[PDB]
Design a protein around this motif. Structure first.
Motif, PDB file in Angstrom:
ATOM      1  N   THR C  30       0.843  -1.193   0.000  1.00 37.13           N
ATOM      2  CA  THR C  30       0.000   0.000   0.000  1.00 37.13           C
ATOM      3  C   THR C  30       0.886   1.252   0.000  1.00 37.13           C
ATOM      4  O   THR C  30       2.034   1.204   0.450  1.00 37.13           O
ATOM      5  CB  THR C  30      -0.929   0.023   1.239  1.00 37.13           C
ATOM      6  OG1 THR C  30      -0.154  -0.200   2.423  1.00 37.13           O
ATOM      7  CG2 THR C  30      -2.006  -1.057   1.128  1.00 37.13           C
ATOM      8  N   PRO C  31       0.366   2.386  -0.514  1.00 40.20           N
ATOM      9  CA  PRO C  31       1.116   3.650  -0.571  1.00 40.20           C
ATOM     10  C   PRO C  31       1.803   4.013   0.751  1.00 40.20           C
ATOM     11  O   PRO C  31       2.702   4.860   0.788  1.00 40.20           O
ATOM     12  CB  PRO C  31       0.047   4.660  -0.982  1.00 40.20           C
ATOM     13  CG  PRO C  31      -0.813   3.847  -1.905  1.00 40.20           C
ATOM     14  CD  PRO C  31      -0.964   2.544  -1.134  1.00 40.20           C
ATOM     15  N   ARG C  32       1.360   3.374   1.829  1.00 40.64           N
ATOM     16  CA  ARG C  32       1.921   3.578   3.163  1.00 40.64           C
ATOM     17  C   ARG C  32       1.683   2.292   3.946  1.00 40.64           C
ATOM     18  O   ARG C  32       0.616   1.688   3.840  1.00 40.64           O
ATOM     19  CB  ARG C  32       1.235   4.749   3.874  1.00 40.64           C
ATOM     20  CG  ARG C  32       1.752   5.014   5.289  1.00 40.64           C
ATOM     21  CD  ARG C  32       0.954   6.126   5.964  1.00 40.64           C
ATOM     22  NE  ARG C  32       1.181   7.434   5.351  1.00 40.64           N
ATOM     23  CZ  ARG C  32       2.140   8.280   5.718  1.00 40.64           C
ATOM     24  NH1 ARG C  32       2.972   7.965   6.703  1.00 40.64           N
ATOM     25  NH2 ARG C  32       2.269   9.447   5.099  1.00 40.64           N
ATOM     26  N   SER C  51       4.583  -5.880  10.346  1.00 39.60           N
ATOM     27  CA  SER C  51       4.390  -4.748   9.450  1.00 39.60           C
ATOM     28  C   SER C  51       4.862  -3.469  10.127  1.00 39.60           C
ATOM     29  O   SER C  51       5.341  -3.491  11.265  1.00 39.60           O
ATOM     30  CB  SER C  51       2.907  -4.613   9.079  1.00 39.60           C
ATOM     31  OG  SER C  51       2.432  -5.770   8.413  1.00 39.60           O
ATOM     32  N   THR C  52       4.720  -2.353   9.419  1.00 42.21           N
ATOM     33  CA  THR C  52       5.125  -1.062   9.954  1.00 42.21           C
ATOM     34  C   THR C  52       4.012  -0.464  10.809  1.00 42.21           C
ATOM     35  O   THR C  52       4.210   0.557  11.474  1.00 42.21           O
ATOM     36  CB  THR C  52       5.505  -0.081   8.820  1.00 42.21           C
ATOM     37  OG1 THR C  52       4.426   0.019   7.883  1.00 42.21           O
ATOM     38  CG2 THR C  52       6.754  -0.575   8.096  1.00 42.21           C
ATOM     39  N   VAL C  53       2.838  -1.096  10.788  1.00 40.16           N
ATOM     40  CA  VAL C  53       1.729  -0.620  11.606  1.00 40.16           C
ATOM     41  C   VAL C  53       2.108  -0.900  13.055  1.00 40.16           C
ATOM     42  O   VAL C  53       1.465  -0.405  13.986  1.00 40.16           O
ATOM     43  CB  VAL C  53       0.392  -1.310  11.249  1.00 40.16           C
ATOM     44  CG1 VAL C  53      -0.124  -0.757   9.925  1.00 40.16           C
ATOM     45  CG2 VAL C  53       0.575  -2.822  11.173  1.00 40.16           C
ATOM     46  N   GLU C  54       3.143  -1.722  13.238  1.00 45.63           N
ATOM     47  CA  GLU C  54       3.660  -1.980  14.575  1.00 45.63           C
ATOM     48  C   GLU C  54       4.749  -0.916  14.647  1.00 45.63           C
ATOM     49  O   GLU C  54       5.744  -0.980  13.913  1.00 45.63           O
ATOM     50  CB  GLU C  54       4.288  -3.373  14.715  1.00 45.63           C
ATOM     51  CG  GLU C  54       4.679  -3.677  16.172  1.00 45.63           C
ATOM     52  CD  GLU C  54       5.289  -5.057  16.376  1.00 45.63           C
ATOM     53  OE1 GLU C  54       4.792  -6.031  15.767  1.00 45.63           O
ATOM     54  OE2 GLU C  54       6.256  -5.169  17.165  1.00 45.63           O
ATOM     55  N   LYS C  55       4.543   0.076  15.507  1.00 45.94           N
ATOM     56  CA  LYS C  55       5.486   1.178  15.647  1.00 45.94           C
ATOM     57  C   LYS C  55       6.940   0.760  15.872  1.00 45.94           C
ATOM     58  O   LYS C  55       7.863   1.482  15.486  1.00 45.94           O
ATOM     59  CB  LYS C  55       5.041   2.107  16.782  1.00 45.94           C
ATOM     60  CG  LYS C  55       4.940   1.433  18.145  1.00 45.94           C
ATOM     61  CD  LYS C  55       4.858   2.470  19.263  1.00 45.94           C
ATOM     62  CE  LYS C  55       6.116   3.341  19.295  1.00 45.94           C
ATOM     63  NZ  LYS C  55       6.131   4.288  20.447  1.00 45.94           N
ATOM     64  N   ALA C  56       7.144  -0.403  16.487  1.00 45.63           N
ATOM     65  CA  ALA C  56       8.487  -0.906  16.775  1.00 45.63           C
ATOM     66  C   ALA C  56       9.365  -1.066  15.529  1.00 45.63           C
ATOM     67  O   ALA C  56      10.588  -0.921  15.600  1.00 45.63           O
ATOM     68  CB  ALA C  56       8.394  -2.242  17.522  1.00 45.63           C
ATOM     69  N   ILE C  57       8.740  -1.358  14.391  1.00 44.29           N
ATOM     70  CA  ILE C  57       9.479  -1.552  13.147  1.00 44.29           C
ATOM     71  C   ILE C  57       9.711  -0.230  12.401  1.00 44.29           C
ATOM     72  O   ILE C  57      10.803   0.016  11.872  1.00 44.29           O
ATOM     73  CB  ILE C  57       8.729  -2.543  12.209  1.00 44.29           C
ATOM     74  CG1 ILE C  57       8.231  -3.756  13.013  1.00 44.29           C
ATOM     75  CG2 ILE C  57       9.654  -2.999  11.072  1.00 44.29           C
ATOM     76  CD1 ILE C  57       9.327  -4.533  13.740  1.00 44.29           C
ATOM     77  N   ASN C  66       8.014   2.282   1.654  1.00 41.29           N
ATOM     78  CA  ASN C  66       9.049   2.398   0.632  1.00 41.29           C
ATOM     79  C   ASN C  66       9.974   1.180   0.615  1.00 41.29           C
ATOM     80  O   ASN C  66       9.780   0.229   1.377  1.00 41.29           O
ATOM     81  CB  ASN C  66       9.851   3.698   0.830  1.00 41.29           C
ATOM     82  CG  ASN C  66      10.548   3.769   2.180  1.00 41.29           C
ATOM     83  OD1 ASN C  66      10.123   3.136   3.149  1.00 41.29           O
ATOM     84  ND2 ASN C  66      11.616   4.558   2.250  1.00 41.29           N
ATOM     85  N   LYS C  67      10.971   1.216  -0.264  1.00 40.69           N
ATOM     86  CA  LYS C  67      11.923   0.118  -0.434  1.00 40.69           C
ATOM     87  C   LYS C  67      12.627  -0.398   0.827  1.00 40.69           C
ATOM     88  O   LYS C  67      12.577  -1.596   1.119  1.00 40.69           O
ATOM     89  CB  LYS C  67      12.968   0.510  -1.484  1.00 40.69           C
ATOM     90  CG  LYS C  67      12.404   0.605  -2.898  1.00 40.69           C
ATOM     91  CD  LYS C  67      13.359   1.336  -3.835  1.00 40.69           C
ATOM     92  CE  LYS C  67      12.792   1.417  -5.249  1.00 40.69           C
ATOM     93  NZ  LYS C  67      13.567   2.341  -6.123  1.00 40.69           N
ATOM     94  N   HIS C  99       8.190  -6.666  -8.560  1.00 40.09           N
ATOM     95  CA  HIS C  99       9.151  -5.714  -9.102  1.00 40.09           C
ATOM     96  C   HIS C  99       9.968  -4.941  -8.067  1.00 40.09           C
ATOM     97  O   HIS C  99      11.185  -5.114  -7.975  1.00 40.09           O
ATOM     98  CB  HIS C  99       8.411  -4.733 -10.027  1.00 40.09           C
ATOM     99  CG  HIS C  99       9.209  -3.519 -10.392  1.00 40.09           C
ATOM    100  ND1 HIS C  99      10.486  -3.594 -10.904  1.00 40.09           N
ATOM    101  CD2 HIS C  99       8.908  -2.199 -10.314  1.00 40.09           C
ATOM    102  CE1 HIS C  99      10.941  -2.371 -11.123  1.00 40.09           C
ATOM    103  NE2 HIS C  99      10.004  -1.507 -10.773  1.00 40.09           N
ATOM    104  N   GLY C 100       9.301  -4.086  -7.296  1.00 39.91           N
ATOM    105  CA  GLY C 100      10.009  -3.285  -6.312  1.00 39.91           C
ATOM    106  C   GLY C 100       9.917  -3.748  -4.873  1.00 39.91           C
ATOM    107  O   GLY C 100      10.579  -4.708  -4.474  1.00 39.91           O
ATOM    108  N   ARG C 101       9.100  -3.051  -4.090  1.00 41.43           N
ATOM    109  CA  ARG C 101       8.918  -3.376  -2.681  1.00 41.43           C
ATOM    110  C   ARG C 101       8.563  -4.839  -2.462  1.00 41.43           C
ATOM    111  O   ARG C 101       9.039  -5.463  -1.513  1.00 41.43           O
ATOM    112  CB  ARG C 101       7.835  -2.490  -2.063  1.00 41.43           C
ATOM    113  CG  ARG C 101       8.269  -1.051  -1.833  1.00 41.43           C
ATOM    114  CD  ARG C 101       7.320  -0.357  -0.872  1.00 41.43           C
ATOM    115  NE  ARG C 101       6.029  -0.057  -1.485  1.00 41.43           N
ATOM    116  CZ  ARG C 101       4.927   0.230  -0.799  1.00 41.43           C
ATOM    117  NH1 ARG C 101       4.950   0.230   0.528  1.00 41.43           N
ATOM    118  NH2 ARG C 101       3.796   0.497  -1.440  1.00 41.43           N
TER     119      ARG C 101
END
Lengths: 75, 41, 116, 177
Positions: C30-32, C51-57, C66-67, C99-101
């Motif tokens: 997702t875009p974020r 995931s990044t929804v876990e503030k620890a990461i 992003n990448k 492809h990317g992420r």
RNA sequence: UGGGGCGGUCUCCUCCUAAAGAGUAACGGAGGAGCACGAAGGUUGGCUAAUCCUGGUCGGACAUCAGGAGGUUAGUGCAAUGGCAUAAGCCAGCUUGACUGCGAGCGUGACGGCGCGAGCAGGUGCGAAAGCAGGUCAUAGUGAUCCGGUGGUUCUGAAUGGAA
RNA sequence: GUGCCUGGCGGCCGUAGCGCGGUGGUCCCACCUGACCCCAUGCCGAACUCAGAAGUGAAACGCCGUAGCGCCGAUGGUAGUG
RNA sequence: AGCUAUUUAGGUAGCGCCUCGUGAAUUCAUCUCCGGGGGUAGAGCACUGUUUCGGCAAGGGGGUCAUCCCGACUUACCAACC
């Protein structure tokens, strides 16, 4: 002018729901995809649903578009 | 914006009979002077 | 519709895996906030997910979505799944192009130990 | 892209007081413009398309899209899947460059012109007008092409009613008669 | 060959008859085939109609474009039926698995024979990889044995070594 | 003790889905800003993709009602039949 | 007194059907219960064709046009798609 008929392909269902079969056994020799391959059940190039495992036949209707499936549970 | 399939852009400065000089990227080849414009509508 | 088109685009790769009975690694781009879940062969209960929804990461990261975020996530899901004890897994494009992420997250899992 | 900025400043507040659009995004944002030319006569003259393809690349800043036949029809004698159409679609910043080229050097050059009629709106806030020439664009070099190829240009927006998009055009001192 | 001279029929594929497994007759009713493609094949990735409503140079009921509705009534090399969007329909890139020795176990036939087939060993190619590919959406595109031609293989070669 | 929310992956496949009215932006989601380059268009940052992210909740989707429809659907009788 | 093949059609061959011998598993048949896919009867008309009718009335024909052409007052009246 008419008077010509091909043959009889002997199609249809071979083994019916709830029957002990072995792997490789043909379940339904169809033409289109009237039925659809299920778990432990393989489909041939002839659309011939055959068994891949050794067990009992089970008929069901899964999927959102309601299509007939043929699966075999391990016995 | 694929490479080598688009004709080049050049900042085109064309004017009007009143003197409405406008600079925008286009693909013409020359800059001519016109009779009317947005200011001459 | 970007939502639905993405879904019918991932159906083939998804159904083929469920007829295989193989444990899969499904990711969500997702875009974020890029996600990643490890679904068991029953497809009902997940094993691990990071995931990044876990503030620890995301706190050790610069940006969420992003990448470098993908490799950090890919690292997290691979290190956790190994600490849980899973070895062989299958990937999942989930409609997204490898492809990317999606690729960034993927290679990070292999170097950690997840076999695929 | 000065009218791109002009749209994002003066026009936005101009419609939030008339229509009272409670949200910022709740505005008739113009999407794309597609300079089309159903040349069609390429049934024999294959090079007729080549001039028109180059003409679109000359007027608009990009190579056009060669359109085939969507369906086979004998009334016009075409089979499905054959070069018959010549079109393009400007989307983004380069769409504004053509839009800037429109109100300043294109529409002013309209022959026998004393008012633009917006009665060609499709019905979903999108305007698909069609003029008989490409001479209005100074990109054509007058004596280079022996025929002034007519065409049809569509301006696609996000409005719903015709007048919501018609008054949208009036925000650029568009002719209305 | 409805007794006979006359016109059609003969092998193969689809539908109906055929009475809801299979099969099931008539000189009963409609039809088609005796191939095609190096790609229309394999694979990874993307896309998905017809149809009308409307607004548009030429262009008007029927070419091109934009939006909406719509929904597979489209398409699918070819007859018809069954099937298909996880598309088998459409497009693109890379390729040749249109591969070799097999083959549990079933289908279908009196038999000859025909059809399907996971997996195993060898090797190949597409894909990041999981995997996929031993022709094509399936069902027609074909004829046994004998005789004989070609190429390969010490397996044999009527004394022996060779050859026929 | 848990509930209100969103997001993802499933079982189940219209009692589940449509039309309609009203609602959600902290998060999340979507849209959106920009696009030397990765990537991409038989034209086009539309999609694919990367870097991000001001603003917004319109679109979109989520939620709560509405049954104007679709849909599930007895009991009984009737058609048919061994 | 069937199936398959046959210069085959009142012949013959294989199989089905009979018999005698032999060897084998509640092997087999009827009934109850459960697990199954079917689409004929019936019902029905979304689909598939077709039905007659009206209307739509587009394609089409003619007095009618400028009856060189676009076009027509209007319409016998068929009418593809509908």
């Amino acid at each position: 002018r008419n008077g010509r008929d091909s043959e009889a392909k002997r199609l249809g269902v071979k083994r019916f729901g709830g029957e002990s079969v072995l792997a490789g056994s043909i379940i339904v020799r169809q033409r289109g995809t009237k039925f659809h391959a299920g778990a432990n059940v393989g489909c041939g190039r002839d659309h011939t649903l055959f068994a891949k495992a050794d067990g009992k036949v089970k008929f069901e209707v899964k999927g959102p578009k309601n299509r007939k499936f043929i699966s075999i549970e391990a016995e | 914006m694929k490479k080598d399939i688009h004709p080049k852009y050049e900042e085109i400065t064309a004017s009007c009979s009143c003197g409405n000089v406008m600079k925008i990227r286009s693909t013409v080849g020359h800059d001519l002077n016109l009779d009317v414009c947005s200011k001459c509508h | 519709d970007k939502k639905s088109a993405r879904i019918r685009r991932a159906t083939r790769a998804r159904r083929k895996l469920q007829e295989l009975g193989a444990t899969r690694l499904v990711v969500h781009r997702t875009p974020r906030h890029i996600y990643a879940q490890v679904i068991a062969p029953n497809g009902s209960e997940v094993l691990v997910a990071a995931s990044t929804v876990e503030k620890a990461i995301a706190e050790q990261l610069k940006y969420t979505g992003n990448k470098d975020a993908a490799a950090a996530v890919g690292k997290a899901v691979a290190e956790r799944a190994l600490e849980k004890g899973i070895k062989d897994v299958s990937f999942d494009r989930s409609g997204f192009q490898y492809h990317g992420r999606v690729q960034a997250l993927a290679d990070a899992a292999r170097e950690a130990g997840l076999q695929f | 892209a000065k009218l791109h900025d002009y749209y994002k400043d003066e026009v936005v507040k101009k419609l939030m007081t008339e229509f009272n659009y409670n949200s910022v995004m709740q505005v008739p944002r113009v999407e794309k413009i597609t300079l089309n030319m159903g040349v069609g006569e390429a049934i024999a003259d294959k090079k007729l398309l080549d001039n028109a393809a180059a003409d679109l690349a000359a007027i608009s800043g990009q190579k056009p899209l060669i359109t085939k036949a969507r369906k086979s029809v004998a009334g016009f004698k075409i089979r499905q899947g054959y070069p018959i159409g010549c079109k393009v679609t400007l989307r983004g910043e380069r769409m504004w460059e053509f839009f800037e080229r429109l109100i300043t050097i294109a529409v002013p050059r309209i022959r026998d012109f004393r008012g633009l009629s917006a009665k060609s709106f499709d019905g979903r806030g999108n305007y698909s007008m069609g003029v008989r020439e490409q001479i209005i664009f100074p990109e054509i070099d007058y004596d280079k092409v022996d025929r002034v190829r007519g065409l049809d240009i569509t301006i696609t927006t996000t409005a719903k009613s015709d007048e919501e998009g018609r008054a949208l055009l009036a925000a650029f001192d568009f002719p209305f008669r």
